[PDB]
Amino acid sequence: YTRVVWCAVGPEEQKKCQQWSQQSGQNVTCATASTTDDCIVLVLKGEADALNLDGGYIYTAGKCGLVPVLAENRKSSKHSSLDCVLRPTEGYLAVAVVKKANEGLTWNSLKDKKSCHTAVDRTAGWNIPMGLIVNQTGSCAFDEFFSQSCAPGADPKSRLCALCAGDDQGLDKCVPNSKEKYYGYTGAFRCLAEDVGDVAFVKNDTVWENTNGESTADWAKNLKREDFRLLCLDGTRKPVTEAQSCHLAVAPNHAVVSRSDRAAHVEQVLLHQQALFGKNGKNCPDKFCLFKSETKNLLFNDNTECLAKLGGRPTYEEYLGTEYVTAIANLKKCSLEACAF
């Protein structure tokens, strides 16, 4: 029983994984794939046990029988009394961010502008934004809405990958793993921060964590929060301090998924591992920390306080909520119950 195999997506996650595997005395081992979809396949086949996923992928995995096990949980003011592990999850805000200096750019004039997306099929980076654009546009030709973009996971020869940079050497352009410079919440923001794009589809937390010296990275050093603005759906523009009233949607937290015949086992090992390398672990700070990786969100988001039990032992639809499942369904009919593998 007692040994779990984690699936890392890309070289960087594999590096962090190997370290975790070592510090765990092999209670956790690693498997590597080039993409999130391939990691899902390895789990299906039973060659890997689990991995943490953005809601967009939880949906894909769910149609294939995988189940949400434990979810990421970040610090909250309200719901201060209960422990992190038993507290319900709040969800994150998906926002559209722009440069203040780009005066006059509103939600209603995004057509033909340049965009930065975390990656195709993800909640805040893709499903929410394109789901809304398809809807208001009446068209499915969402590949022709922005003049150019960087949407990791699309066809490299297409304009949707036009703005992506690849790795240190230009290799791997547009792959949906961290080797791509503008991949994920951080890459998408960098894409905008460096003015590669006009708008970026990330989450509220990303702006705060890479501005006002929160990120020591070279491209974020000098970034100032007041030089950014959120795009609201009412065609208005607000300070990043107002995400509560200028977001596109509230997304369900990323969560660890596994095959159901493995969940009980994955869950148990994870909570113990968490007591060891979690936020207040026996060994986190001194030897190793699961939720740390220098602004890179490798394996887990850097702002995870802990992985929380779920309660209501929800199926994937319940976890994602009727709201969002419906959003994804309506967008996917443009590309209807699957196991899309």
Ligand X SMILES: OC[C@H]1O[C@@H](O[C@H]2[C@H](O)[C@@H](O)[C@@H](O)O[C@@H]2CO)[C@H](O)[C@@H](O)[C@H]1O
Ligand Y SMILES: *[C@@H]1O[C@H](CO)[C@@H](O[C@@H]2O[C@H](CO)[C@@H](O[C@H]3O[C@H](CO[C@H]4O[C@H](CO)[C@@H](O)[C@H](O)[C@@H]4O)[C@@H](O[C@@H]4O[C@H](CO)[C@@H](O)[C@H](O)[C@@H]4O)[C@H](O)[C@@H]3O)[C@H](O)[C@H]2NC(C)=O)[C@H](O)[C@H]1NC(C)=O
Ligand Z SMILES: *[C@@H]1O[C@H](CO)[C@@H](O[C@@H]2O[C@H](CO)[C@@H](O[C@@H]3O[C@H](CO)[C@@H](O[C@@H]4O[C@H](CO)[C@@H](O[C@H]5O[C@H](CO)[C@@H](O[C@@H]6O[C@H](CO)[C@@H](O)[C@H](O)[C@@H]6O)[C@H](O)[C@@H]5O)[C@H](O)[C@@H]4O)[C@H](O)[C@@H]3O)[C@H](O)[C@H]2NC(C)=O)[C@H](O)[C@H]1NC(C)=O
Ligand U SMILES: *[C@@H]1O[C@H](CO)[C@@H](O[C@@H]2O[C@H](CO)[C@@H](O)[C@H](O)[C@H]2NC(C)=O)[C@H](O)[C@H]1NC(C)=O
Residue 222, binding choice from ligand Z, ligand Y, Fe ion, none, Cβ under 5 to 8 Å by partner class = none
Residue 2 contacts which entry, Zn ion, ligand U, Fe ion, none (Cβ below 5-8 A, type-dependent): ligand U
Residues making up the annotated binding site for Fe(3+) are: 54, 92, 185, 254
Q: Which residues are annotated as a binding site?
A: 54, 92, 118, 122, 124-125, 185, 254
Nearer to ligand Y, 10 or 131 (CB): 131
* Listed ranges 151-159, 238-246, 301-309, 318-326: which one lies at the site for ligand Y (CB under 6 A): 318-326
Select from 24, 177, 258, 274 the one that contacts ligand U (CB under 6 A): 24
Verify binding: residue 204, ligand Z, rule CB under 6 A. yes
Tally of residues, the chain: 341
335 binds ligand Z (CB under 6 A): no
Nearest to 133 by CA among 107, 167, 158: 107
Helix (H, G, I), strand (E, B) or coil at 4: strand
Q: What is the per-residue DSSP string for 66-126?
A: EEEEEEEE---SSS-SS-GGGSPP--EEEEEEEETTSTT--GGG-TT-EEEES-TT-IIII
The continuous run of DSSP H or E covering 136 comes out as helix 128-137
- Compute how many residues bind ligand Z; rule: CB under 6 A: 12
Contact call for residues 68 and 314 (beta carbons, < 8 A): yes
CB closer to Zn ion, 146 vs 319: 319
The residue with its CB nearest to Zn ion is 318
Query: Which amino acid belongs to residue 24?
Result: S
- Starting at the edge strand that comes first in sequence, how are the strands of the sheet with 28-33 ordered? 28-33, 4-9, 50-53, 255-259, 66-73, 306-308
Q: Which does 195 bind (CB under 5 to 8 A by kind): Zn ion, Fe ion, ligand X, none?
A: none
Task: Give 158 or 244: the residue with its C-beta nearer to Zn ion.
Answer: 244
Residues 94-133 that bind ligand Y (CB under 6 A): 128, 131-132
22 CB-near residues (< 8 Å, 6+ apart)? none
Q: Which residue is nearest to ligand X (CB)?
A: 321
Which residue intervals of 140-248 are DSSP H helices? 184-193, 204-209
Binding interface with Zn ion (CB under 5 A): 318
